[model samples]
Target: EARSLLNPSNAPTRYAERSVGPFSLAAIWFAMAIQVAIFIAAGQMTSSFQVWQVIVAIAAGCTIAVILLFFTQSAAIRWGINFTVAARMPFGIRGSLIPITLKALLSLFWFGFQTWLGALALDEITRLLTGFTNLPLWIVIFGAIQVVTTFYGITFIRWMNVFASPVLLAMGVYMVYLMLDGADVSLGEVMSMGGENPGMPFSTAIMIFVGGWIAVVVSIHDIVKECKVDPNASREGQTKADARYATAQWLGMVPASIIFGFIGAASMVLVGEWNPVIAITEVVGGVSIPMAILFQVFVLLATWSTNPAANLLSPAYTLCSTFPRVFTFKTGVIVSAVVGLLMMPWQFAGVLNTFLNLLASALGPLAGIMISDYFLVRRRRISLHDLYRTKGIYTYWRGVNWVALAVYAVALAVSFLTPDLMFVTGLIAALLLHIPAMRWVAKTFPLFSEAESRNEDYLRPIG
Candidate 1:
C-alpha cells in the first residue's frame, strides 16, 4: 500500500489514451495566450519603442519561449510523464517536492488573480445589464464555475478551448478593426510611428516578453504529455512528430500575441490609453450597451479558458502527487479553488507583478536543470519502472539530488545579478553548470554511479 503512493493511478498515459491532437493543442495554446496583460504590456512598450519594434520583440520573445518549451517538454512527451514525474529524475523522489511546491505556489497565486479578474468582468457585466454590483459574490460564483469545469480534467479543458479559441480570435480581430476604424489610422501608420520618449532597450523589451511566459514554459510538460504521439514511429519520424506539435504551439500563440499587441500599441498611439477595457470602450464611441457587454463576455471567456489549464492543472497535479492517498485530481481542483478564494486576490493585485518577477527568477533555473539533466546528462533516457520505486536510480542521497539543488542555488544567485534578463541568465547558467557537475560527481563517488548510470534504454522495450 505504501509503495502505491509513488505510482498513483495517473501513471504515464498510454499512447492509446493520448487524445490531444495538433489542432486541439493549438486551440489550447491560442486560448491561453490571449490575455489582457499582453495588450497592456505591448501598449506600454509603445511609449519607448516603435510599433514595429514592439511587434518584432514580441515575435522574437514568443519564438524563443516556444523553443524553450520544445526542449523542456520533449522528455515528458517522449516518456509519457507529467512535470512532477519528470522532476523526479533531476530533483530525486523527495527533492522533486521543491519544483512541485514552487510551481504550485506560483500557479495558485495566478489562479486567484485570474479568477478575480474574471469576477470583476462579470460584475461589470451584471451591473451594466441588470443594475447590480457585488464583486465578492461574483468572485466566489466565478471561481466555483471554473472549479467545476476544471474538475472534469483535460478532455473538458480541450473541448472548452476548442470552442472558445475561435470566438476569442474573432473577437480580437473585431476589436482590432474597431480600434483602427474608429481611430481612422492604418496599421502601416501605427507601425511606422516612432517612440515619443526614450524607453527601454530593444533587448530589454524582448526579455520582457520572454519573462512573461517563462513560468508557463517551465510547466508546459503538464500539457504536452497529453498531446498525441505515434508510438510506432521511427526515431526520425518521432522528431517530425515533435516538430509538428511545436509548430502547433507557434501557430496558436504567435499570431494572437502580435495582433493583440498591435491593438495595444495602436491604442496607445491613438488614445493614450493602455488598458484594453478603456481603449476598447473609447474607440467604439463610448460605453455603448452592446460593446460593453461584448467586451466583458470576452474577458470572462478569456480568463476562464486560461485559468483551468495554465493556473489550475499544474498545481492540482502537484497536490495529487504529494498526497496521492488523500487527494485525487478532482479533489485537488476543489482545494485549489477554495484556497484561491481565500486569497482575496483583489487586495494583492498591486504586488502580484513583483511576486511574478521574483518567481520568474526561480523557475528559470528549474527549467535549466531539467533540460540539462534530460538532454545532456541522461541523453533523453529515463527508466519507467524505477521512477516509481523507492530504491530506484532517482533516489540519490536520501532521495535528494544535492548536486541539482546546489547548481540551482548558484544559478539562482547568478540570475539576480541581471534582473532584467534573469530568466535567460539563470537558464543558461544552470544548463551549462549541471552537465559538468553531474559528470564530476558520478566519477568521484561510487554512491552516485547507479543514479547517474546511462545504461538504461531510452524507451521501455515492448515484448
Candidate 2:
C-alpha cells in the first residue's frame, strides 16, 4: 500500500524514531509509579489508618501496582492511541463505534475534571499574586487559562512534560523538604514498600487502578508506529519487538512515580498525616517566596499540558476515521478543550485516586482483546488501509466481532460487579478471552490489496 506517510512532502525522518529515550522514559516511570496523590487520597479519605500506616498502605499499593501495569501491557502496546482509537483494531471500523463513543464521553468527563483542577491551580496562583478574588472570578480567570493551553492540544501538552523537569524540581523541591521535615520519613524502608501487607489486600490493591480513570499504557504506540516505517505515518505498525520495547519504556514510568512517592511518603512520615492540598502543595512551601509561586505556575502548566496530551490521543484517531473529510489537529484540540473545561478537575480530585485504580483495571480487557487478535490471530503485521476500509477484511465476523466484544463486556462487567475480587476477575478475563480469539479467528480479509495481502499473507496463513 502507498501510505501517505511516505509522500515526499511529509517530514518522515523528523517524525519517526520519536520514542522517549532512557532519560524521559525513566522520568515518566517515576511520575506515574509513586504519584503520591493516589495514596494520599486513599490515606486521607479512608477512615482506616494513621499517617505511618498510610505510608505502609501505599507501599503495598505500589508493589501491587507493578503487577497491574504488567497485566495491561497488551492493550498499552496494541491500542497506541487512547481507549477510543484503540477499540478500532480490535472492534473493526464500523463495529468499534459504540465503545469509541463511550470512551469519548468518558474523556469529556476526565478532561473537564482536569481542566477544573488546572484552573484551580491557576486561580490560587493568580490570587496569591493579586490578592483574594471571588470563586466565580477565579473560575472565569482560571477557565481562560485552561482554554489557552488546552485549545492548542498535543504539541503544547507534550512540550509541557518535555520542559517540566527543571521547573517541577525548582518548585516541588522545597515542598519535598517540608514534607520530609514534617513526616520524619525513612527513605530506606519507604523504598521497601508494603510493610503492612506483604501479600497486599487484593481488594485494596485492585482498587488502585479501578478507582476511576483508565490507566493509559499504550499511550505512545501510534507515535512509535509512526516511527516504524516511514517517518511521518501517525502509526507504522509496531512489531512485537517494538511492543516489548514500548512496554519497557512505559514500565519505566515507575521510577518517576516512586520519587514522587518518596517525597509523599516522607512527608507523611514527618507530619504523621496527609491532606488533599498538602499532597500536592507541601513540596512548594520549603522554597523561597519568589520560587513558591513559580512552583504552582509550573505545576499548572504541566498539568494542563499533560492532561490535553493524554486526552487528545484517542480523539485524534477517532476524528481521522469519523470525519476523514476534516480530521485535523485543530479539531482534536478544540473538542478536547471543551470537554476539559466542563470537567472541573477539583471535583474529580476527591475521586482521582479512585479513578486511577479504575482506569488501570478498565484497560485490561481492551488490552487482552486487541493484543490477542494482533499476535495470535493476525500475527505481528497490520494492513493499515484494510482496517480503515468499512467493508474490508477487518469488517468480517459480523459488523462487530462478537467474540472480542463479548470478552470486553464479560471482563468489564465481571470486574465492575465483583468489586472485592475485581482484579482477579479482570486478570482471568484477560487470559481467558485470548484463549478463543487467538485460535479461531480467520487469517484472511479481502480488505488488503492483492499485492498487499500477498506480501502480508504469512501473517495469517490458515489451515
Candidate 3:
C-alpha cells in the first residue's frame, strides 16, 4: 500500500480499491475553463485554414488528449501509482528522473505564466478602482497567495472547481453568445474573413493545438489515480467505474476545447486579437459596474482554478520527489512561489508559444514511450516490487534505460530541426523505436530479469 509519497495520508493506498469518482475529477478539469483555451483556439485562426478546418483540428487535439489520458489511466488504475513511480518500469529508477525533472520544471514555468496572468487581471481590477498601476507588487502578492491554495491540495482544489465551475461555465457561455450574437455578420462572413497570414502552416497549427495540453496530459495520472470504487465488485462493476472516469475526462475537455476554442477562433477573426482577455475586457467596459466587477471575478477565478490544478499540483509532487526528506506539499508551495517570482514570466512572454512547442517536442516522446511501454511492450503489466527496488528487472544498465533515453533524444532532435507536428512526429518516432530498441538492449546486455518481467500481476491478491 505505497500511497503516493506526495499525498500519503490523503490518497487511495490500495491498488484495487478506488476512492475518488468521475465527477470529482471532472470538477478538476472543469476549472480549466480558462482564457488560455480560448487563446489556443485563437492561434489557429490564420487565413491559411478554414474555420471548419480549425474546428476539426481542435476536435482532433481534444480527442488525442482524451485517448492519451485513457492509456495513462489504465496504467495508473492497474497500479494505483503516480506518473513518476510507474515511469520507473519504462525509464528505470534513475532514468525516471529525466522526465520527472522535465515535467516538474515545466509545471513551475507554467505556474509563473499563470501567476503573471492573474497579476495582470489583478492590476486591471485595481486600476479600474483606484487608477494606479502596481503590477510588480501585484504579482509578488499574487504568487504568495497561490501558495495557500496549492498547499491545501485536493480538498481546496476540489472546492475551487465546485465553486468556480458554474461561474466559469456562465462566463464561457457568455463569451460564445457575445461573439456570435453581437456580430451582425453571419458565420459565412466570419469564415470568409481574414486578417494576418498568421504565418503558421497547417501541420504546425495542429501540433500546437494538440501540444498545448501536453503538460495536462502528462500530469493527469495524478487525477486518475484518485478514482474510488469497490475493487472486489464483479467485472461489470469495474467496467462501470472505468467508463465513469472516461466520461469525466471527456466532459472536462469538451467545454473548453469546443466552446472556448470556437470563441477564440471567432474572436480572432472578428477582433484580430488572439487573447480573450482583451475581448473580455472590452465587453466588460460597456456593462454596469457590478457586472464589470463580476467579469473580473470570473477572470480571477479562472486563474485560481487553473493555477492550482495545472500549474501547482504537478510541481508540488515533483518537489516532494526531488527533496523527499526535507520537502512536503507545504514547503513545495513556498519553493514554487519563490521560483514563480524569480521566473519573471512577462520577459519571456514573447517566445512563450515557441517554448510550449519545444516542451511538446520533449513531452510528446515521453508520452509515446509511456504508452508504448505500458500497453504495447509490457501489455499493461508492471512489477510493483521491482518498480521500488534498485536491483531488479526494471534496473537497466546502471539505473538508466538507454533505449528510452536514446529514443527520446532522437525524436526530440528531429522534431526541433523540422519543427512540424512536433508531438505527433516525436510520438511516431518513439513508438517506432522503443519496442525494437528495448528488445535489442535487453538481449545485448545482461541487464534484465525474466522472472521480474513475468511476475507483472499485483503483489496483493484481489478476489
Candidate 4:
C-alpha cells in the first residue's frame, strides 16, 4: 500500500524532461493573470479608490504575490515534484490529503467560474452572429474545449499560452481604444478621477488584490515543476536560475495585472460600468458587430489560457495523488471537468467575493507551513526516496504531523482576528510558529525526527 502511493501520474518529472523555458514560463503566467475578472475587480475598486490608487494597489499586490510564488515554487523546480508530493513533506503521507483536498476544491471552483466566464463570451458571440440565444449549449461547448485541452497535459498548456499571450494583449489594447473612443474621455481625464465617497484603506485594497491569487500561489508548484533549469548547477547557480525564473514570473504577471486593471478602472470612470464584456459591448458593439465578436474571441482565449494552467492542473494533479490507484493524471482531468460543469458557476456569481476571501484564509497557512518545512526545518533538503516510504521520517504519528496541524489550526484562528488581512496573518502566523514547534517536537519525541541527514545528498545531482 505504501509503495502504491507514488504512481507514475503523481511522481516527479525527470530532470532531463523538464522542458519549459523562461520565456514560455512567463507567457504561461501572462495568460493566467490576464483574465476578465481582474478587470471586474479593478472596476469594483473604483467604488472605493481613485483609478491611480487602484492601479498602484494592484501593482503592489501582484509583486508581493510573485515574490511569494518564487519562494514557494523553488523546491518543486529543484525536485520536479508536484504540489501534493511537496505537501507530503510537511503534512506526512496520509496527512498530505489535507492540503491536496483543499487545493483541489479551490481549483475546481475557479475552473468552473472561469469556464463559465468563457462560455458567457462564446454565448454572446453566437448571439451576435446567428441571433440565437442558448447559454447552456455554449457553456457545454466552451467547457468541453478547455477540458480537452487540459487532457493533453502541460506541454500543450505551455505552447497554448505562448501563442495566446500576444493575441490577448492585442485585443486588450484594442478594447481600451474602443472604450476611450466611445466614452469620449481622454486617458488623462480618467486617471485624475476620484471616488465620490470614502472607501477602503489602501492596505485593505492591497489585501483584496492579494487575496485573489492566494489559492494559485499555494499550489503554483504544480506548474513551476515543469520549468527547466540546469540540474547540475551549484547552490549559487541555482539561486541565479531562480532569479531568472522569478523575473519571468514578474514580467508575465505584473504588466498584465496593471494593464487589464487599468482598463477596468478607466472603463468605470468613462462608461459607468466595469465588466469588460458589458462595457466593451455597450461602447464598441453599438458601432461594430465585428469588433464585438473579436472581443468575445479574446475573452475565450484569455479564459482558455488561464483555466487549464492555473485552475485545472492543481486539482487534476491533487486528484491523482489522493487516489493514486484509481486515478491517472488524465482521469483526474476528466473528473475535474465534470465537477466544474456540475458547479454551474453562472448561478452563483454573487457569492464569488465571499468565496475568494474564504479561500485565501483557508489556504494561506498551508503555504506558510510548506515553505517553513522545506526552507526552515529541512533547510531546502528532501529525501525523495523516503517521501514515498511508509516508515520514513515524514510519517509522523501514524502518517500525520499533529504539530503542523495544530499550528495550522492556531494560524487559522489568528487569521479571523483581522478578516481583511486574514491571508497575510495566517501565513505569517504559520511561518513563525511551525519551525519552533517542530524543534520542540523533535526534542520531546524520539520517533518524530526532523528528517534524516541523508536527505541533503538528494539535493545534489540525482544521477
Candidate 5:
C-alpha cells in the first residue's frame, strides 16, 4: 500500500503518501531556474544601472522573492494539502471553485507558453543540423513530449529534476565562461558605467517579479507534498520533517535566483544579448558543433524542467480534486496538455508580460485570502476530512463561500489600483477584508461559526 501510494502510475498522490523532502524539491527548481532570472535581468538593461549594479539589483530581488515564497511553502508543509483543497477551509469548499479554475487556466497558459519556447528552440536546432524548420510540427512534438513526461506523474517528475539539475548548473557555468572569453570590459568597469535609462525603481521591479512568478510558487504543494515521501515517518517525527522542508526550501531558492539572475545580467553585458540561450549561441557561432548541441540540450532540459510542474502537475491535481469522480490526475494532465496545444501561445509572445501582470492580479488575491484565512481566521487548523467531502464542514451555503469570493473580487480591484505592487497590495487588501467578511457571515449564519472561527491547531505539534 505504501509503495502504491508513491507510484507514479497510480496518478494523484494520496495525502498520506507525500514523501518529497526539501532537498529533492529544491533540486527541481534548478532546472530552467534561469527562466525568471532571465526575464527579470533582461528588463534591467533598459534601466541605467551598470552591469554590476544590475547584478546587485537581481540579488536584492531574489532576497525579496525568497521572503515572499516562504509563506506559500510553509503553508504546504504545515497541512500536506494541494492549493485547491487548501482553499476549501477558508473559501468554503464550493466557493473555492472560482479561484481554483482560474489558477488552473493560468497554469495552462504557461504550459503553452513554455511549449512554444521549447519548440522554437528545437526548430532552430533542426535547421542548424538538418536544414528543416517546420515550426508547427515541432510545436506538436514538443507538446507531446511534455504530455508524456507529465503523464508518468510526480514520481518521474522528481527524478527528472534530480538528474537535470547538476547538468544545468554545469551548462550555466560553461556558458558564462564562454560569454566572458576575451571580453573587452572588466566586471568592475561594467558595474561602474552609468547607462541611458534609470529604469523602474528597484523595490517596485522586485515586487513585480514577485507578483508575476508567485503564481508558480503558489503551487508549491505539488512538490512539497513529497516531503512526506517517507511514509514510515511516525507522527512524532513530523516536526523534524517540517523543519527539514523549511531549511531546504529557504536555502535553495534565494541563492539560486541570485546566481541565475546575475548570469543573465552578466551575459547581457558580455554577449550583447539578455536571453541566455541566444547569448550562448551567439558566443558559439561558427565555432563548435558539440557546444551548439549542448546548448540546445540546456534549452530543452530547462523548458522540460519547468513546464511539467508549473503547467502540468498542480493543475492536474486541482482538477482531480474538483471533479473527484471524473478526473483522475492522469486525465487532468491530458486535459491540460490538450488545452496547451490548442492555445497556440506563440500569438501572444509580444505581450506576455502584460498578460502576466493581469494574471498576477487574480492570483495575488487568491493567495492573499488563502494566507489570511489560514493564519488569521482559522489559525491554521484544517479539518482534513472536510476537504475531501462535499457535505462536511467546508460545504458552506449550498456549497459556495461568498466571503472568500467577495474578498477575491475586492482584492483584485485593489491590485489594479496599485499595479506597481499588485500582488503585495492585493494580498494586503484580501487579508484585511477576509476576516471582516467572515465575521459578517458568522453573524448572519451563526450555526457555522466554528468554520469561521480561530484556533492554534497548527501551533501544537502532532502526536
Candidate 6:
C-alpha cells in the first residue's frame, strides 16, 4: 500500500502536529489584517457607480467568500494534508499535480507581492520621518519582517494574531472616529457609491472579490482538522461539517472572517477616500505626524501578521512532500523567509490594479474546484489515509486527475478571461464541472472504503 509513506517507522514525526482552537483557528481565518487591506483596496479601486451597485457588489463579494471558503475546505482535512497534497482526492494523482503546481506558483507570486506591500507599509511610516523616504530602506525593513517570521515558523505567526488583531481593531476604530467626525456617509450614500463613477465596472469588483476567496479553498480542511487534534475526537468532528453538505471547514470560517472585510470597507468609507495612508493622515492631520506614524506602524504590524501565515504554508506544501529530508515544514519556513528578504514584504503593499487582477485569477479557480468536489463527489465524507497514499484509493496514474484538473483550468479561465460574465464564473464553472466528473468517479477510481467513511469507523491509525 502507498500508506508506507505515512509509516511511523519511516515518517514517525508526520503525526507530530500543530494545535489550534476556535480562538487561534478563528484568528487565522479572520485574517483581519490582510482582509482590511483587500477591503480598502476594493473601495479605492472601484469607482462609485451607483448606490445600489455598491451594496450589491459588497454583497456579492461577501457571498462568494462565504460559499467558496466553506465548500472547498473539506479536501484538506479529510486527506490529512495541506491544500496541494490533498488535491489528489478529486483532481486525481496526476490531475492534482497541475493544481498543486499552480497553487505553489501562485503562493510564490503572492510571496513577492505581499512582501512588497509590507515594505510599502514601512514607506507609509517612514515617509513622515523626513530625509528617509527611501524605498531601499523600507525594503530592508520589509525583508526583516519576513526573515523574522520565517525563522520563528508557525510559533511566531500564531502569536502575531494573538497580539496583532486587537491592536488592528483599535487603530481602525480610531481612524474611523476621525472619519465619522468629519462627514456623514450614510449607508444609502455608501451603497449608492457602487453604481456611480466607480473606477471599474461594478461587475469587475464582484468578479475580483469572488475570485479572491477561490484561492484559499484548498486549505480549509487542514485548519479544521487542526482544531480537532484532541485525542477524544476525530478529524471531521473538529468542524461544523454538520453545517450541511454545502459547508466546508473554511466556509465555516467565513463568519469569523467576513466582518474583517466589512470593517475594511467601512474604514475606507470612514476615511472618506480611496487612498489608505491618506485616510490615516486626514484623521490625525498633517501636524500629528506622531499619530500618523503610530497608526501606520500598527497597520504594518497587522499586515505582517498575515504575511507568515500565507508564505509559510506554501513552502511547507512545496517541500514537505517533494523533498522530505531537506525541505521539511520547518526548513520550508527558513527557505521562504530568505525568499521574503529578496522579494521583500513591502512590495505587496498598496492597492494596485495588477495586485487585484492577479489575486482574482489564481485563487478563484482553486476554490471553485474544492467546492464542486465536496458537494458532488465526496458528499462531505473524507478519509485521511486513503487520500495520502498513491497506491491507495485516491490514486491517479502519473499523479493526474483529469476531471479535477480540467475543472480547475476551465474555471480559472472562465473567471479571469470572461470579464463580461462577472464574479460567479469560477463557482459556476467548478459546480458545473464537478457534478458530471463526480458522478463518473466510479470508472476512474475508488474514493474511500465503506468502513473508513467517518469517525466511528476508526480506532487506531491504519498501518
- lDDT winner: 4
- What would you estimate as the lDDT of candidate 5? 0.67
Name the weakest run of 10 consecutive residues (lDDT summed) in model 1: 446-455
Model 2 quality (TM-score)? 0.71
Clashes of each: 0, 54, 6, 0, 8, 51
Judged by whole-model lDDT over C-alpha atoms, candidate 6 comes out at: 0.56
Better of 2 and 3 by lDDT: 3
Count clashing residue pairs in model 5: 8
lDDT of 2 by residue, 97-184 (tens): 7656655655566555655556566667767778875565655565456557655443343455556655555555655655544545
* Native-to-model Cα distance after best TM-score fit, residue 153 in candidate 3, in Å: 1.6
lDDT of 3 by residue, 125-150 (tens): 88888899999899888888888766
TM-score of 1: 0.93
What lDDT does the true structure give each of the candidates? 0.80, 0.49, 0.69, 0.81, 0.67, 0.56
Q: How many Å off is the CA of 291 in candidate 4?
A: 1.8
TM-scores, all models, native as reference: 0.93, 0.71, 0.84, 0.93, 0.86, 0.75
Worst 10-residue lDDT window, candidate 6: 7-16
Candidate 6 contains a number of clashing pairs equal to 51
Q: Can you write out model 4's per-residue Cα lDDT over 282-399, one digit (the tens) per residue?
A: 7655557876688778878888888888788888887887778899999988888889779776567686867756865688789899889888888886777777577776778898
lDDT (Cα, tens digit) per residue for candidate 6, span 1-463: 3533342211211223435544565565445324444655456543554434444565566665655555554444333355655565677645666656656655565666666666766887766676467776766667565766656545666676767666666665665556545555554454434423535666666765555554444454433444333335354554554234233324333443343444445545555565555764655555466766786686667667765666456655556655554556656656765664565434444445565565546555565666656666677676655654566666665556666667666777777666645336665777777778767766767665653554333323655
Q: Kindly provide the TM-score of model 5 when superposed on the true structure, using C-alpha atoms.
A: 0.86
Ranking by lDDT: 4, 1, 3, 5, 6, 2
Cα-based RMSD of the predictions, in order?
A: 3.0, 6.8, 4.2, 2.6, 5.2, 5.3
Q: Model 4, stretches more than 4 Å misplaced?
A: 281-285, 444-463
TM-score of 4: 0.93
